[PDB]
Ligand binder design. Structure first.
Ligand code: MG
Ligand code: MG
Ligand code: MG
Ligand code: MG
Ligand code: MG
Ligand code: MG
Ligand code: MG
Ligand code: MG
Ligand code: MG
Ligand code: MG
Ligand code: MG
Ligand code: MG
Ligand code: MG
Ligand code: MG
Lengths: 62, 63, 97, 139, 190, 86, 143, 139
RNA sequence: GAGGGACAAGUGGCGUUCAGCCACCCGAGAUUGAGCAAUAACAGGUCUGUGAUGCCCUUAGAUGUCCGGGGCUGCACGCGCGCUACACUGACUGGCUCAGCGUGUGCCUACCCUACGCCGGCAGGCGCGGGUAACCCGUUGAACCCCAUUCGUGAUGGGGAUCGGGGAUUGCAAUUAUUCCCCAUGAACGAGGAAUUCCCAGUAAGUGCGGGUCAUAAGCUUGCGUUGAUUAAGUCCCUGCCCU
């Protein structure tokens, strides 16, 4: 597997059971400004660098 | 939490409805104009009114 | 020769120095100033309740003993004139030669 | 330069078995002599404690034990020893190693004769100084 | 006309290899002072602990388990003597294998609970670079303590051998064990 | 009483393992030939390494330090950090 | 050079004070502080043998500070966190046997004058004694 | 030609008796690298090693401390001198080198003019600390 | 002690016209910790605080009363809050160095802290000064901590209950409770099970002191500090509360 990296476009909303995680449409620094909307935990800003060990489960919650 | 109470807004509209001929764009003069033309029994309430009225002043010139 | 000031409400105390000085420094005098002693606080804590019920909440009372010292070296026929001053009731002005 | 000295575990006072670690703390293993009476018997026997317990010779052991069994000859007054004013003899000394089991049972047997409850609460399953005894010494 | 050095050190040519940890390991010379201890007003802004060096962050987490919560003099001395051991070992400054331990013991994806409003599914979620630095430091400062408990070594000695064996990525330290279990946890929970 | 301990956390370290009180000349040749000839030396290192007691370890290592052979780095309260020079 | 007694390193100067006091034999110790040394309520005897030289040295600089202080004051100076076991640790003040004795020996060497409002203070005898050693131990330390 | 300038750490004091002279450093009657905890070495050394030389040579600042704790003194000493470097450059040398040496140390560390005041929160009545409580008893 | 300044007062942006939110600027400080508290209720606690008291009970052999012993302190146990702990980050001997609020006798009714000095191992014993007090106790020489020595991973020197023999203080007397000191006995205890409590910054924990009953008397209380973290800054998943 190749592992790829990405920076964050804009912050959508904080979810979880506990409200612990932040749903991040990240972007692709692999390609054009497509993305996957990923569920990152930890303190996070826009433009933060993310290590994507999966580019597949593109999970959307309003 | 700048969510200032009625009695700030009560005075600040009667500020503007009596003595407009002294007020200006400035805060640090109207903070002392407010003392000469009113009855303010509290010193935090000196600043709290005067920051609101001069913030209101930029609308009165505007709309 | 000196005069100690000790009182309870400090509005009265600043004015009892002012009633001293307004009645003093138009005479031939060499007067000192109100030396700020540290205001003392005898604190009292109370259980708030005669019995053992409920939460454990404490009343917390404090007195505040203001104290200043002023100084007059002079003849005493002025001291027996400044003796004739109407006074606030919570004010105890003791004398010292 | 301390090559190696032949001293592992020795015989002292025929009832207690002492080690090799440090000379003031090897003699801890005797009943009736603990931490500090060893420290005072050693240092007024003028023995180097920085030199190990495992480095010491035959006469020096008995020179320790001579003052262990008799400190009142030289030094070390009554407040530091073990026997108090009453032993039924008016006698001030230190107990020995195996003497400690006897002096206990002599305390207990007369405290039984006296009908003192300082002795009866050691006889009964009770506590003299356990002044709250709800939670004291369970099962 | 002054440059900043720290101790007996230079704070220079510590080239952090990857991004997803840059902006977050603060050993730049815009965030390099002389000493670890700072007046921490680092509970005011949320992300204002980006602006803190990881050398202080390893001291601040090293004081844990109760008897040691306190004594910042002592826990810097351990890091001072952790510096003083790894510098002797192969050259190759302790600051360098400190940096490359965070890159290697940082569990690049982890787990939590999400919904469906039913029973627990434990989706495999990702992790911010700040929590990478947060979780890597915590395993190392635990990694000193459970290694050094009930043996003859000191806190500085076990932690120094902890730091090298964690930046030597071949399965020898408490952190790398705890991380490489979490990748096994992440695959199971995906 | 009955120590019916509700807890369970076992797995203790190594069975009160023995340790050497004073050195041998087997130990002394183990000392004089390679206790410099590592690269990093703590008295805590050499204690577990060669199965030697630490009060004897700081006895032996300070002695080859006293001749000046061992090149330390510093001393403080807790730790005494050595090295071999040349 | 111009050497204040604080310009030297502190602990060696007060521990090299102990060795030059051995050079003369300056002490007066009756029977009991020969016999058992204990501190306030502490664990053992002192490991270090030269504790007379050690108590006298710590006596020096703290009397170099506070003249008109005294035996009850140097009782306060040492201090010690007494343990209790189950009950938490309180504080007890210093000794008073050596806290007069260690002051007796220096008064044997003409180093105490007594205030009538207060107590001990240094003399220009003893004031010279520390500073000449501070001459030599910093000249030892830099060299 | 002197100002007696105050640093004000948490419960600490360092009066900076600032004066043009030959270059001196005192800590309440005690010289420069006489410092009581050794971990805070480089902290009392932080100003002079980051300011410069010609600055340090001309000025005598001797410092009296009425502190509250060890580390509390040491940050007070630095906050004093790095306000004394602000204070002495207020009064004699022009502001184009005062405000620029102030820009030096603040781009290093902000607290050297910003005295950020932190007394402790008071011990609340319900709990043992300033914020804690006690264990409740439930059923 | 009077008087000053923090208001989002300027810029950016999101904003019904708004209310306002969010970054940055200079500023010590962009809100610190409290304190006092809404209408209405519980048959929540106190009749043992009372010269606040209703009704029943008791009053000459007294449910009034002092006085003299004993109890409230008993222990196969169960639960609660705590304290020192379970060790090498340490234990010990010493050297070093620096707090903050507060406390103190002839009172409207029973009554002190302590300077210096000597004696005594230690607790303590004696004489003199000072304090009805920013004077003096007191530049409260507070501890934690720090600089060296030993120990060396050992239920050990980690741990101090029980138990032995004494030495001192207060008291009307301390026995079946005192307090303090000394030697000596050296006890379980290997980081604590299913469950749960407290906490977002000088906060938590580690560490000491002063105040309240006190003649002796703090583990509890209530304040004072000192070394001063970790992770958050979000949710309604658990418990609960608020508006439709
Ligand atoms: Mg704990
Ligand atoms: Mg404790
Ligand atoms: Mg209400
Ligand atoms: Mg009821
Ligand atoms: Mg009644
Ligand atoms: Mg009636
Ligand atoms: Mg009862
Ligand atoms: Mg229970
Ligand atoms: Mg033990
Ligand atoms: Mg003990
Ligand atoms: Mg709970
Ligand atoms: Mg009191
Ligand atoms: Mg109290
Ligand atoms: Mg109670």
């Amino acid at each position: 597997q190749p592992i790829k990296l990405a920076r964050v476009t804009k912050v959508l909303g904080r979810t979880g059971s506990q409200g612990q995680c932040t749903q991040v449409r990240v972007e692709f620094m692999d390609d054009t400004s497509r993305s996957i909307i990923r569920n990152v935990k930890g303190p996070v800003r826009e433009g933060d660098v993310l290590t994507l060990l999966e580019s597949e489960r593109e999970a959307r919650r309003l | 939490g700048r969510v200032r109470t009625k009695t700030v807004k009560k005075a600040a509209r009667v500020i503007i409805e009596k003595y407009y001929t002294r007020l200006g764009n400035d805060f640090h003069t109207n903070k002392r104009v407010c003392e000469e033309i009113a009855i303010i029994p509290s010193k935090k309430l000196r600043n709290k009114i005067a920051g609101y009225v001069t913030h209101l002043m930029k609308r009165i010139q505007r709309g | 020769i000196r005069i100690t000031l000790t009182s309870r409400n400090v509005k009265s105390l600043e004015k009892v120095c002012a009633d001293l000085i307004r009645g003093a420094k138009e005479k031939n005098l060499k007067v000192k100033g109100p030396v700020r002693m540290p205001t003392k606080t005898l604190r009292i804590t109370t259980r708030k309740t005669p019995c053992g019920e409920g939460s454990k909440t404490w009343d917390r009372f404090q007195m505040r003993i203001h104290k200043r010292l002023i100084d007059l070296h002079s003849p005493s026929e002025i001291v027996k004139q400044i003796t004739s001053i109407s006074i606030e009731p919570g004010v105890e002005v003791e004398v010292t030669i | 330069v301390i090559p190696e000295k032949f001293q592992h575990i020795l015989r002292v006072l025929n009832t207690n078995i002492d080690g090799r670690r440090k000379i003031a703390f090897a003699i801890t293993a005797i009943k009736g002599v603990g931490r500090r009476y060893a420290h005072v018997v050693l240092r007024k026997a003028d023995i180097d404690l920085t030199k190990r317990a495992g480095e010491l010779t035959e006469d020096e052991v008995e020179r320790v034990i001579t003052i262990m069994q008799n400190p009142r000859q030289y030094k070390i007054p009554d407040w530091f020893l073990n026997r108090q004013k009453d032993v039924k003899d008016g006698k001030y000394s230190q107990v020995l190693a195996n003497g400690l089991d006897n002096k206990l049972r002599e305390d207990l047997e007369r405290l039984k004769k006296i009908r003192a409850h300082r002795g009866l609460r050691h006889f009964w399953g009770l506590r003299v100084r356990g002044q709250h005894t709800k939670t004291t010494g369970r099962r | 006309p002054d440059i900043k050095l720290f101790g007996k050190w230079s704070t220079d040519d510590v080239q952090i290899n990857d991004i997803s940890l840059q902006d977050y390991i603060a050993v730049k010379e815009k965030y390099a002072k002389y000493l670890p201890h700072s007046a921490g007003r680092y509970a005011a802004k949320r992300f204002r602990k980006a602006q803190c060096p990881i050398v202080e962050r390893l001291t601040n987490s090293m004081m844990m388990h109760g008897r040691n919560n306190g004594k910042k003099l002592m826990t810097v001395r351990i890091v001072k003597h952790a510096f003083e051991i790894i510098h002797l070992l192969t050259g190759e400054n302790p600051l360098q294998v400190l940096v490359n331990a965070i890159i290697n013991s940082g569990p690049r994806e982890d787990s939590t609970r999400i919904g469906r409003a039913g029973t627990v599914r434990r989706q495999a979620v990702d992790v911010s670079p700040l929590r990478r630095v947060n979780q890597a430091i915590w395993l190392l400062c635990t990694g000193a303590r459970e290694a050094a408990f009930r043996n003859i070594k000191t806190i500085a000695e076990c932690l120094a051998d902890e730091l090298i064996n964690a930046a030597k990525g071949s399965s020898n330290s408490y952190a790398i064990k705890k991380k490489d279990e979490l990748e096994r946890v992440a695959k199971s929970n995906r | 009483g009955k120590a019916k301990k509700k807890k369970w956390s076992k797995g203790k370290v190594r069975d009160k393992l023995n340790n050497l009180v004073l050195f041998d000349k087997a130990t002394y040749d183990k000392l004089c030939k390679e206790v410099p000839n590592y690269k990093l030396i703590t008295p805590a290192v050499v204690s577990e390494r060669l199965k030697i007691r630490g009060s004897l370890a700081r006895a032996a290592l300070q002695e080859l330090l006293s001749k000046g052979l061992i090149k330390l780095v510093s001393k403080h309260r807790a730790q005494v950090i050595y090295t071999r020079n040349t | 050079p111009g050497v204040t007694v604080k310009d030297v390193n502190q602990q060696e100067f007060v521990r090299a004070l102990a060795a030059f006091l051995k050079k003369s034999g300056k002490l007066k110790v009756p029977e009991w502080v020969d016999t058992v040394k204990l501190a306030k309520h502490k664990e053992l005897a002192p490991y270090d043998e030269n504790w007379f030289y050690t108590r006298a040295a710590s006596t020096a600089r703290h009397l170099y500070l506070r003249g008109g202080a005294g035996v009850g004051s140097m009782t306060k100076i040492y201090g010690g966190r007494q343990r209790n076991g189950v009950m938490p640790s309180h504080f007890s003040r210093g000794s008073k046997s050596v806290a007069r004795r260690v002051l007796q020996a220096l008064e044997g060497l003409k180093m105490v004058e007594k205030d009538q409002d207060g107590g001990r203070k240094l003399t220009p005898q003893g004031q010279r004694d520390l500073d000449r050693i501070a001459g030599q131990v910093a000249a030892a330390n830099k060299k | 030609q002197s100002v007696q300038v105050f640093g004000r750490k948490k419960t600490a004091t360092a009066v900076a008796h600032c004066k043009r002279g030959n270059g001196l450093i005192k800590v309440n009657g005690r010289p420069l690298e006489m410092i009581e905890p050794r971990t805070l070495q480089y902290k009392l050394l932080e100003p002079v090693l980051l300011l410069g030389k010609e600055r340090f040579a001309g000025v005598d600042i001797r410092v009296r401390v009425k502190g509250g704790g060890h580390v509390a003194q040491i940050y007070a000493i630095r906050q004093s001198i790095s306000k004394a470097l602000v204070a002495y450059y207020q009064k004699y040398v022009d502001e184009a080198s005062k405000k620029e040496i102030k820009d030096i140390l603040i781009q290093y560390d902000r607290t050297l003019l910003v005295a950020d005041p932190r007394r402790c929160e008071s011990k609340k009545f319900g709990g043992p600390g300033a914020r804690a409580r006690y264990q409740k008893s439930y059923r």
